[PDB]
Amino acid sequence: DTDRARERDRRHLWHPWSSVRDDRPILVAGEGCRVRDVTGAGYLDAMASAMNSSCGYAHPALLEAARRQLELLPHFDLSAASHLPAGLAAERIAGLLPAGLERTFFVNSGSEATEAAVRIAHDHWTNRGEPRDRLVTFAAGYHGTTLVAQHLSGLPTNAIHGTAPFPVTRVELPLEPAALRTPEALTLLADAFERAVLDGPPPAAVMVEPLLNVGGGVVLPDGFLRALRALCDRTGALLIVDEVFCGFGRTGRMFGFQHDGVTPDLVTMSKGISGGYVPFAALTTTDEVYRSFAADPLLGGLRYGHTTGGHAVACAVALAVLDVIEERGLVGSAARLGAELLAGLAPLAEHPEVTDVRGLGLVATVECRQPESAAALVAEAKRQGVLLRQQGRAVMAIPPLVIDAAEVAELVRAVEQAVARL
Amino acid sequence: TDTDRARERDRRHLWHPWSSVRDRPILVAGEGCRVRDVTGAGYLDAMASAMNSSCGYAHPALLEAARRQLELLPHFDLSAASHLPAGLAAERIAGLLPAGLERTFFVNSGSEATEAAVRIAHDHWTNRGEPRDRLVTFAAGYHGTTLVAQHLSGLPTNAIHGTAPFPVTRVELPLEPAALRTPEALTLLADAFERAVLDGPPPAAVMVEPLLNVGGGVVLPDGFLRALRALCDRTGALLIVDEVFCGFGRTGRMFGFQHDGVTPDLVTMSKGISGGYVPFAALTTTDEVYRSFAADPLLGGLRYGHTTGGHAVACAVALAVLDVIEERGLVGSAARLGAELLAGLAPLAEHPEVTDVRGLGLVATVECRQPESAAALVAEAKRQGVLLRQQGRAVMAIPPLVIDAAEVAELVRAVEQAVARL
Ligand SMILES: Cc1ncc(COP(=O)(O)O)c(CN)c1O
Ligand SMILES: Cc1ncc(COP(=O)(O)O)c(CN)c1O
Ligand SMILES: [K+]
Ligand SMILES: [K+]
Ligand SMILES: [K+]
């Protein structure tokens, strides 16, 4: 059986983001923040399954919501019909966002949310009789895996397989991530984005994460998004914030953008929204953007949509996730336990192979000098009983939001033990 | 007042897919082939929820499979780990496909499957040291809603929001769909695709559906895919068959391409694979294509992947779907009952307003002379208690594969009554 399982994987399964050339762990069961492999070895899962297990494994509220809705109605095509969970989820998600962010479109993944967002930005300007094709982004940003999503990024492995479908101006970090959390760095960042925005005709949108995930758990200086909000007002560009990773408590606020206290024009969301239990993603925008689509000549609406976008089970699970977050105070717990986590790890920056320790809420990153060190850190933490996420030179701790104080201490100890062996 | 509140929150907060900005039934529960709205009215659901409920609503085997896996492990990141459902599903899907199709990549939607398939096609040629950028498609084809997927289509509402990321040669239908089922139509289609393939440097791939869904339930003549197989074999282009709609029994074979009896180089799948119960999609290709990715200079593998691609609950549900399809013989049932459905509808072509009646298995279409007639037909059928899908001029019946002879007769009677009132 173990022979056969390894063999069917080797022969038939194509893994994402992996080389064709140690065996991978086979995970089989989880409970709370712990997960177990096929040999019975147990681990604290400090990568939250796929950076999205906001409520941990086998959460009874999420399980029951899924079961109830699956039995009733898994979905129905929302193009010419509706269902009750889509209405509830659309209302509830709008309710968590600033005034004016009221209109929610559902898709399956963060990449599809990016696809819809970029279409909405371009088409909005067409609808207004003033076409704009250009977007401004971070070079170190990651917005998904489809051609349009990858085109927004300047990360080397995101090189696209065609030619550019529209112009993008990708802003490089003006300092190393370790030095980005100062007032001096805010000035450099704001001015770099001002130059990018004013380089040629006004852009359709500026699209950024509030904390860069795949780009290395990069924490931005206070005021950066506020500076972008001002730039967008001056130029007309839509401010799009990608909350796919930061959304729903990850950083110790309901959304990453709330640390700066800005109101975006469009927000994308996925990951923690459904606890990872059903594929689900969403975007929310303004009534002005929405209503502009009455000018679309071909349909009189947005020419976008997926078969399972707005899946009823996904919507029902998301509502249960939001109930758990609110009932248990997971946003506040993430802030408080997050502070403990970061404080526990911070002294490891004294180690010669550790360049920086940085984070916000329940994302924390140990940046090593080389990827080789990062891989060795991750391997030793695994030996200590803790699963972490490697991202090039960065090692990231991204636990379920239901993590407790004892488990945070265990996480810190494992990372200390790993750094000692570097 | 509950229903009023529901309609109001939808109107205020929900952005529907593929819809005009400027009312809709609210479906609340289903069982087998029947669904009920919020007012209590019941219908035979002859659009299978979202053209994807292969096993109908509240199927106990699928419900149990979802419950069991959700409780164990909803997913884990497949980039550097594995889980047992992904290995099982990869093997099982490959086993249903012809010899040589062995390597399966998982994504959430048909649109993502197209994104991955086009990247694979382009990157495969780069890996070989002979870059090829061009694809050949049907202008009336539909492959999804993201920019790349829309670019493959020539349908007017799929106009993209940027410029072409690669060249596409889109073949127009040489005859109306009603005249496309003959040996003369085969000659015209084969010759048109030959001209497209030989127009300029050899293409990377030829990508087609085996029966055009969104293009109007268009049935292609016997031998068309065999002609494309020879053209791909002549020029080296990859033969990509889009089975997102036709896959898993819909046309009375396990795959739509099996009517012609060809071996594609890559097949995309979604819809019926998970019964609609969890968002799920897949693609399967050859070892020749797979192993070429060792030459990728940035990763040594395919630079693609989604957070929830290979979702364990989705995989476990797909395994249960395949068990139901096989145990119940739904492929052959769809062939036989589908032939009875088409034979029941066929005399309606005598009506002045009906220009064709066409189908294969459990997709059947009544083509009207104008969209207004099609809309009227759908509306009267709904009054008779049957839900059908409008696709421009085309009215489509796409029931769950578990439909029985009595329900087929109900379906035929509703459509007869509808056509009588045109
Ligand atoms: C900020 C951000 N945006 C978009 C995505 C893409 O989401 P998916 O993998 O669900 O397509 C990710 C995935 N890591 C992300 O971190
Ligand atoms: C043949 C075909 N390919 C791809 C897609 C796109 O799939 P999705 O809606 O799941 O993105 C569809 C959707 N109708 C389809 O019919
Ligand atoms: K709001
Ligand atoms: K095979
Ligand atoms: K006629």
Author numbering:
A (entry chain A): 16 to 36, 40 to 440
B (entry chain B): 15 to 36, 41 to 440
What does the paper say about this structure?
Pseudouridimycin is a microbial C-nucleoside natural product that specifically inhibits bacterial RNA polymerases by binding to the active site and competing with uridine triphosphate for the nucleoside triphosphate (NTP) addition site. Conversion to pseudouridine aldehyde via alcohol oxidation by PumI (SapB in S. albus DSM 40763) and subsequent amine formation to 5′-aminopseudouridine by PumG (SapH in S. albus DSM 40763) are the likely sequential biosynthetic steps. The pyridoxal phosphate (PLP)-dependent SapH catalyzes transamination, resulting in 5′-aminopseudouridine with a preference for arginine, methionine, or phenylalanine as cosubstrates as amino group donors. The binary structure of SapH in complex with pyridoxamine-5′-phosphate and site-directed mutagenesis identified Lys289 and Trp32 as key residues for catalysis and substrate binding, respectively.
The structure of SapH was determined to a 1.55 Å resolution by X-ray crystallography in space group P212121 using molecular replacement. The asymmetric unit of the crystals contains a tightly packed dimer, and each polypeptide chain shows the fold characteristic for PLP enzymes of the fold type I, subclass II. The overall fold and the mode of dimerization seen in SapH is essentially identical to what is observed in the fold-type I aminotransferase family, for instance, in the related 7,8 diamino pelargonic acid synthase23 and 8-amino-7-oxononaoate aminotransferase24. The dimer observed in the SapH crystals most likely represents the biologically active form of the enzyme as the cofactor binding site, and the active-site pocket is built up by residues from both chains constituting the dimer. The binding site of the PLP cofactor is located close to the dimer interface, with residues from both subunits involved in cofactor–protein interactions. The bound PLP was modeled as pyridoxamine, according to the observed electron density map, and because the expected covalent link between PLP and Lys289, conserved in the protein family, is absent in the crystal structure. The aromatic ring system of PLP is sandwiched between the hydrophobic side chains of Tyr160 and Val262. The phenolic oxygen atom of PLP forms a hydrogen bond to the side chain of Asn23, and the ring nitrogen is hydrogen-bonded to the side chain of Asp260. Extending from the bound pyridoxamine 5′-phosphate (PMP) to the bulk solution, a pocket is formed that represents the active-site cavity formed by residues from both subunits and lined with hydrophobic and polar residues that might be involved in substrate binding and catalysis. At the opening of this cleft is a flexible disordered loop region (residues 35–43) that could act as a flap and close the active site once the substrate is bound.
